[PDB]
């Protein structure tokens, strides 16, 4: 075998690749667009779905989705278009020959590995295949052996405490609180400052504000102080059709629903203390070990400031006695795809994946008893 | 005190009168026109603008022109003069004595309520007042403490989930699909039959039109077939010069952009899944209550066969185990005003207003710390 | 004196009742829930705290929260709460006249019974009150004076040996895993089928459906393997908001966890070896008389088949050689009350009374010279 | 022959080291450790099972567990794992070049005595041995040969009387009241201030606190009463996670258990009388020499103030006429690994080796008649 597939099917991007390299080649949207008006020009290739990169250019006419919701795919239907997408269009291989190895977040839905199963085993016909965790694979990244993941992308954010090489499945958080939620906050106080963003393709552009305007305050309360003072916070944005918006406190109202959860009328914990009841339910021993490794990973921690808040405040949770240390990488919105080519690239893992005749004397049900 | 005034400012009408009453005293249209022809006759009375009935008697000589559009009032030198047209030439009162309760959309801008914060102090000198959200003031108006409420006007179309006298805010859903924008869909379907209506002065025919012959159809593919045996369906009305039309399938067509809003091109949901997307968002145990209660008002829910209709397709939402009521009264065009005549006679209420006093120590930015 | 109070502040549930009565009075759920929305409508009684069968009505709009966690009260503030809604709004009584017998479980913090003691003499200014031992008053419920209690309630198991009169406190045996840490492992593996249950409102529906469809399987391998054939197994449950959920090897797991406590995560043993380690902890002589009565009390000993699997397993550990007999009575849940209300009415007991008189020279400290 | 190896096997560490040196290369606990969580990390040296220092290392994900209760080798398939972990890892030698000196206690059973001489020459084939008794190698270690010694370690408490070189082996007693037993004790009753130490993990930390805090009073109801104005007796003790304890009179409950076992409940006597029990059952011309030799050893001993309560305690129950004297070391801990290193390297000794010859020709059975 030359290689495998690595392809971490997040709920907002789609990173693929091939294991044993450094960044996955494959970075693009994880949405479907159907387009939605007349269509009267004849010919000129109007095809009837846009996936990826083609579904954000044609943005303004299409009625874009996502297939997969909070980590659980939704839209089988969808979602074989786009790994047909990926494999075929975009890093252009055969899947009949690389064994292909997918993640998905923990306490998701039993259905949802086993459908990804039998897709890749039926309708893609791989040698191969295995479904690994993405927390695990973000602490292959780091190239630590023990600490508790904060892993938050677009659908989901979970905490799994991990000691030397042990995880700890009844200490597994799972939160619900994303990306994609603090869109959805966005685009609803945007509205305060008479900006409304109404479609999906709207739905597209207050995401690009967020990823490039939105920081974390270390002391909301002051920076909230600060913002009655309305000079030296608000930043402008220049929209695609031409127009600029002027946002001012919602540059920290959003990343503060991490931490507050109710703003968007959640009756659940931040991510910090989500952390600490993570390591609390974990034995008294490695405690000592939990606080000193706190990897961060996922694109919703890379606001600016949020290690510096989940350091400031796991530290008036935790006794003062000892040292917490969040471990941000440069490189942590990538680091699920990282640890998945470091995993599928070593020696002693090349027995555990589920083989294609593996599973036709045990069916889709072979995941469960080999993976997790 | 006697009184107090609750003047429900529309966007299509100015509903005014005083708290404790049956029925608003004041309704006209909310029009500001300016004449736009010559004016050769000398004397006899040439004002510069008309505001509200005037303006409807003569309007084939003026520009007419709303100053509130979506519910943001956008043209605050002609909104003042509303206000001064319903206060000393509608109602005849003294505003100097009477607190004013005032009523807005929710999600709406925050510029927009400081702004009638300011006037009603500085330019009216108001002792107190009050911004109340509509769609909790019409269900005070039907008595319950319990129910979404489906608000639909001129301007905007809002539910509010309200439970046991608590809002829930996160689930407040606001489409910019009204009565305007229906009007708008039927004069662009009245023009295949060959009406063309283009101006202002027209605008408030083919509203009137609506107001008088539309009908909300409870299957629309079949009355669309009925429509092709085009005898049992024409109704006839007669425009203001002589002539008259013969409108078919236009009766039916320009309601069911409510419930398809994709005929004016928006991508977005009818005000039957928005509804249903409102209670999904609630908590799940509130969700019996919230079916057994949907509170219509506003004008747009006053067509023929909307409630039959909203009954009939919630119902193809929602699981079958459980009963839909959707609660139509004969007055809702009115409830937004009944309701805040309620509120404003209430002995508990009377400590809420923002009063002089108090808003010359804090500006117009009292508002938002007071209201909601 | 007319009569006494029997006051059974378990962890999730409040019995409460008269000396010498067959049944409690006051069953509620101990919860207090606080409000977490806006709470926009005006008077109509909007209470800042909801206790026992108004915060379960409630629920869908407020944070409801335990004060008792695994017997050790927290929340003194709360519990106070749940007290004065117990006398005055649910007995309807005045503390004042009436001695009030308390029980709560062994193995206890010493400050949570002084502090008990402190709030029934300063608070509520009792003539009298005892704090007695749960596992206790469940054999005077049977009747009997020998045997081993198996207690397990909402929030601790506990095993108590009693031979004829004599405690042997050496022996008590005490696990945190109950009622409420089943729930917890309920809402784990309900996730996996694709029912998310996150806020504290839904953890009381939860708890419903494991009080009428959870059971105890006898072997558990064995029913492991028929809920492969999936036919015979699913039932059916209707939630509040009308939705239904198909629940199937999930009946059986979550009481497998009494037996097997590395489900949840504990290294320690189930209830069936507790049981046989608290009885190899009595004298050999006691041992024979242990075996014949096992006493089995509070509500999660009430599952179906659950002493068909103590007595199945208990002598898989016992030698074969005499026989074992696990007293299951009917009214099992609720027997801490009824041998509180036989031990509160005996004449021999009345002089084993903490007074006021005797509390006010010896301060909160003299519960444990006189209790146990 | 270069050397001989001397290893004490108690029931908590394991001594060993090699004849004629003053303390034991290699002292570690003497336990075996399995992990018992999931094990998700591929590679990395994940074993099976961790032996002494690594299993205390890692302890928080590792069942551990003790091969030797009470004196009694329950676990011979781990109990050759710790001795392999000994000789190999600890050590570094070779068994088969080396006579090696075991310890056990007396009044032990016999079968534990041959399984152990079955063990070292036929899986390990060490050229000899011999199977000492510790109480004896005690007085070695003091240099003297007339003493009643108790010797007190992790598993069982023992004395054996000793006049010029004879033994009275019908006045040994022993008591299986220990060190692991008062770990018990003191696990009961750090409940009582509400720390809940429960897994097998915690029992290494509840042993390190009683290492370090607890005390033997001198007189136990002066200090119980010292208690009640508890001020100058609480110390402070930092738990592994971050956490305090703030512990008072529990730093001389447990040990008094020692000198009153009915605490956990055992019909037996204390350290001071079955001292004096198995004084006056020797000679009555002895009794003089034994009451002024009276030679402690183990860690139990270890104590503040055992020492000056044996000696005050004694002298209640000895008649007045004549002293006694409490002989306690500084190096008491390793007494008995002191004596058994100036045993095997006396030149008298070296005839009374059970041989590799010696053993074929009579099996595990010449243990008895060569030993004791
Ligand atoms: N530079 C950034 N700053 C803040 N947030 C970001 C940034 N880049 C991406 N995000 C957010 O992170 C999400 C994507 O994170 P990622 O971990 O790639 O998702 P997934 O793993 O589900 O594909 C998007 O929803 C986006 O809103
Ligand atoms: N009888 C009616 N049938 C159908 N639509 C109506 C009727 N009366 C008014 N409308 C529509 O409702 C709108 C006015 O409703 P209203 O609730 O008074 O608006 P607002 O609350 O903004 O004043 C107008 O656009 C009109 O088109
Ligand atoms: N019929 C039932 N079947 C199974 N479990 C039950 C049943 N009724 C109650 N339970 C469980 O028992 C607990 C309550 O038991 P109870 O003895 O009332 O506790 P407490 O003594 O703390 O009041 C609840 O957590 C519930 O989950
Ligand atoms: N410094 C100390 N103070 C009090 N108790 C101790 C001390 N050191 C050890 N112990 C207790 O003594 C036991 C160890 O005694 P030891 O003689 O080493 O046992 P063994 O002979 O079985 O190895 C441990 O269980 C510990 O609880
Ligand atoms: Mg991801
Ligand atoms: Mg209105
Ligand atoms: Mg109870
Ligand atoms: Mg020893």
């Given at each position: 075998?030359?290689?495998?597939?690595?392809?971490?099917?997040?709920?907002?991007?789609?990173?693929?690749?091939?294991?044993?390299?450094?960044?996955?080649?494959?970075?693009?949207?994880?949405?479907?667009?159907?387009?939605?008006?007349?269509?009267?020009?004849?010919?000129?290739?109007?095809?009837?779905?846009?996936?990826?990169?083609?579904?954000?250019?044609?943005?303004?006419?299409?009625?874009?989705?996502?297939?997969?919701?909070?980590?659980?795919?939704?839209?089988?239907?969808?979602?074989?278009?786009?790994?047909?997408?990926?494999?075929?269009?975009?890093?252009?291989?055969?899947?009949?020959?690389?064994?292909?190895?997918?993640?998905?977040?923990?306490?998701?839905?039993?259905?949802?590995?086993?459908?990804?199963?039998?897709?890749?085993f039926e309708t893609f016909?791989?040698?191969?295949?295995?479904?690994?965790?993405?927390?695990?694979?973000?602490?292959?990244?780091?190239?630590?052996?023990?600490?508790?993941?904060?892993?938050?992308?677009?659908?989901?954010?979970?905490?799994?405490?991990?000691?030397?090489?042990?995880?700890?499945?009844?200490?597994?958080?799972?939160?619900?609180?994303?990306?994609?939620?603090?869109?959805?906050?966005?685009?609803?106080?945007?509205?305060?400052?008479?900006?409304?963003?109404?479609?999906?393709?709207?739905?597209?552009?207050?995401?690009?504000?967020?990823?490039?305007?939105?920081?974390?305050?270390?002391?909301?309360?002051?920076?909230?102080?600060?913002?009655?003072?309305?000079?030296?916070?608000?930043?402008?944005?220049?929209?695609?059709?031409?127009?600029?918006?002027?946002?001012?406190?919602?540059?920290?109202r959003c990343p503060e629903?991490?931490?507050?959860?109710?703003?968007?009328?959640?009756?659940?914990?931040?991510?910090?203390?989500?952390?600490?009841?993570?390591?609390?339910?974990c034995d008294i021993d490695?405690?000592?070990?939990?606080?000193?490794?706190?990897?961060?990973?996922?694109?919703?921690?890379?606001?600016?400031?949020?290690?510096?808040?989940?350091?400031?405040?796991?530290?008036?949770?935790?006794?003062?006695?000892?040292?917490?240390?969040?471990?941000?990488?440069?490189?942590?919105?990538?680091?699920?795809?990282?640890?998945?080519?470091?995993?599928?690239?070593?020696?002693?893992?090349?027995?555990?994946?589920?083989?294609?005749?593996?599973?036709?004397?045990?069916?889709?049900?072979?995941?469960?008893?080999?993976?997790?």
């Amino acid at each position: 075998e030359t290689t495998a597939l690595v392809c971490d099917n997040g709920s907002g991007l789609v990173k693929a690749g091939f294991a044993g390299d450094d960044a996955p080649r494959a970075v693009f949207p994880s949405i479907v667009g159907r387009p939605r008006h007349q269509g009267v020009m004849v010919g000129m290739g109007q095809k009837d779905s846009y996936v990826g990169d083609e579904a954000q250019s044609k943005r303004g006419i299409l009625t874009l989705k996502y297939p997969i919701e909070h980590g659980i795919i939704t839209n089988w239907d969808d979602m074989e278009k786009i790994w047909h997408h990926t494999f075929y269009n975009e890093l252009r291989v055969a899947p009949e020959e690389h064994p292909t190895l997918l993640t998905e977040a923990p306490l998701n839905p039993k259905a949802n590995r086993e459908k990804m199963t039998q897709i890749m085993f039926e309708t893609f016909n791989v040698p191969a295949m295995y479904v690994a965790i993405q927390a695990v694979l973000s602490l292959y990244a780091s190239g630590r052996t023990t600490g508790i993941v904060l892993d938050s992308g677009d659908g989901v954010t979970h905490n799994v405490p991990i000691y030397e090489g042990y995880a700890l499945p009844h200490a597994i958080m799972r939160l619900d609180l994303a990306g994609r939620d603090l869109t959805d906050y966005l685009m609803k106080i945007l509205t305060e400052r008479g900006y409304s963003f109404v479609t999906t393709a709207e739905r597209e552009i207050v995401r690009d504000i967020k990823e490039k305007l939105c920081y974390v305050a270390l002391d909301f309360e002051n920076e909230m102080a600060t913002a009655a003072s309305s000079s030296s916070l608000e930043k402008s944005y220049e929209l695609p059709d031409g127009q600029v918006i002027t946002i001012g406190n919602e540059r920290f109202r959003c990343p503060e629903t991490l931490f507050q959860p109710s703003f968007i009328g959640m009756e659940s914990a931040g991510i910090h203390e989500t952390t600490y009841n993570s390591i609390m339910k974990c034995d008294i021993d490695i405690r000592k070990d939990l606080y000193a490794n706190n990897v961060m990973s996922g694109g919703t921690t890379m606001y600016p400031g949020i290690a510096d808040r989940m350091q400031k405040e796991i530290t008036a949770l935790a006794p003062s006695t000892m040292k917490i240390k969040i471990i941000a990488p440069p490189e942590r919105k990538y680091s699920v795809w990282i640890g998945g080519s470091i995993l599928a690239s070593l020696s002693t893992f090349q027995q555990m994946w589920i083989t294609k005749q593996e599973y036709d004397e045990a069916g889709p049900s072979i995941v469960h008893r080999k993976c997790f």
